[PDB]
Amino acid sequence: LAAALAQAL
Numbered sequence: 594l595a596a597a598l599a600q601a602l
């Protein structure tokens with residue numbers, strides 16, 4: 594889940 598968001602950065 595964290596990675597799914599972190600792609601934004």
Ligand SMILES: *C(=O)c1ccc(-c2ccc(C(=O)OCC)cn2)nc1
Pocket residue numbers: 594595596597598
């Ligand atoms: C949420 O974005 C997210 C994405 C990917 C993963 C995840 C956990 C573990 C592996 C892995 O290769 O584990 C080897 C033990 C890959 N991806 N978790 C949360």
Ligand SMILES: *NNC(=O)c1ccc(-c2ccc(C(N)=O)cn2)nc1
Pocket residue numbers: 599600601602
């Ligand atoms: N928000 N994330 C990024 O902007 C981001 C872009 C690219 C990469 C990345 C990581 C690792 C490789 C590699 N070839 O091992 C390439 N690009 N990370 C984050």
Ligand SMILES: Cc1cccc(C)c1
Pocket residue numbers: 596597599600
């Ligand atoms: C951070 C990241 C790695 C692999 C695939 C996705 C969608 C995101």
Ligand SMILES: Cc1cccc(C)c1
Pocket residue numbers: none
């Ligand atoms: C982010 C990442 C690196 C290496 C291997 C996996 C499955 C995921």
Ligand SMILES: Cc1cccc(C)c1
Pocket residue numbers: 595598599602
């Ligand atoms: C915004 C964010 C949360 C967790 C992990 C990373 C790399 C970024």
Ligand SMILES: Cc1cccc(C)c1
Pocket residue numbers: 601
């Ligand atoms: C407020 C906000 C928007 C997009 C992405 C993040 C990590 C935060």
Ligand SMILES: Cc1cccc(C)c1
Pocket residue numbers: 602
């Ligand atoms: C270019 C940029 C916008 C927002 C957040 C970061 C870390 C960089």
